[PDB]
C-alpha cells in the first residue's frame, strides 16, 4: 500500500556508456522495479510532465545541477518531485516489504552485473 496517487516516470536517458547486454539487463531491472511499484498502487507514466510525482533514473542525481533547464531531471527538481536511482527505488520497495525476487519468474540475482568485480576479486 503506497501513497494515494503516486505517478512514477522512468527516465529513458542514460549518462553512462555500456554494452548491448548490460543495457538489456538495466532494462530488465527497470521492468522489475516497475512491477514492484505497480504492486504498491503506483501509476507508471509513459510521458514526463508536471503531474509526475516520482522520477526513477539511471543518471547522476548528484550532478543534476549541471543539466539543461529542459532536461526532465532539472524540471523534476524544480517541481519538487522525488528523484531516485534504481538502488534507492529498490531500497524503498524493500522497506515496504515488497519481495522483488517473488515478482519475477527468473532469478533476481540474474540481474546482478558481477563479472568485472569478480575478475578483480580473483586477481587479488
Bridge partners, residue 10, by sequence: 56
List strands edge to edge, sheet with 54-57.
43-45, 7-10, 54-57, 82-85
Contact 88, 114 (CB under 8 A): no
Experimental method: X-ray
How far apart are the C-alpha atoms of 50 and 120, rounded to whole Å?
44
How far apart are the C-alpha atoms of 97 and 77, rounded to whole Å?
28
Which residues are CB-contacts of 25 (< 8 A; sequence separation ≥ 6)?
111, 113
How far apart are the C-alpha atoms of 15 and 8, rounded to whole Å?
20
Q: What is the DSSP string of 17-60?
A: ---HHHHHHHHHHHHHHHHHHHHTT-EEESS--TT--EEEESS-
Contact 7, 43 (CB under 8 A): yes
* Element (DSSP H or E) covering residue 4: none
CA angle 18, 19, 24 (to 5 degrees): 95
Distances (CA, A) of 15 to 80, 102, 106, 119, 121: 22, 30, 28, 25, 27
How far apart are the C-alpha atoms of 30 and 76, rounded to whole Å?
19
Q: What is the DSSP letter of 64?
A: G
Bridge partners, residue 44, by sequence: 8
Contact 86, 39 (CB under 8 A): no
Of 63, 110, 112, nearest in space to 87 by CA? 112
- Final resolution, Å: 2.4
Amino acid at each position: 500500500h503506497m501513497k494515494r496517487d503516486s505517478r512514477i516516470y522512468f527516465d529513458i536517458t542514460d549518462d553512462v556508456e555500456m554494452n548491448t547486454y548490460n543495457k538489456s539487463k538495466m532494462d530488465k531491472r527497470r521492468d522489475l522495479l516497475k512491477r514492484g511499484f505497480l504492486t504498491l498502487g503506483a501509476q507508471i507514466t509513459q510521458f514526463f510532465d508536471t503531474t509526475v510525482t516520482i522520477v526513477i533514473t539511471r543518471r547522476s542525481v548528484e550532478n543534476i545541477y549541471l543539466l539543461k533547464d529542459t532536461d526532465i531531471l532539472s524540471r523534476a527538481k524544480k517541481n519538487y518531485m522525488k528523484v531516485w536511482s534504481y538502488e534507492k527505488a529498490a531500497r524503498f520497495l524493500k522497506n515496504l516489504d515488497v519481495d522483488l525476487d517473488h515478482l519475477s519468474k527468473t532469478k533476481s540475482a540474474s540481474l546482478a552485473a558481477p563479472t568485472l568485480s569478480n575478475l578483480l576479486h580473483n586477481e587479488k
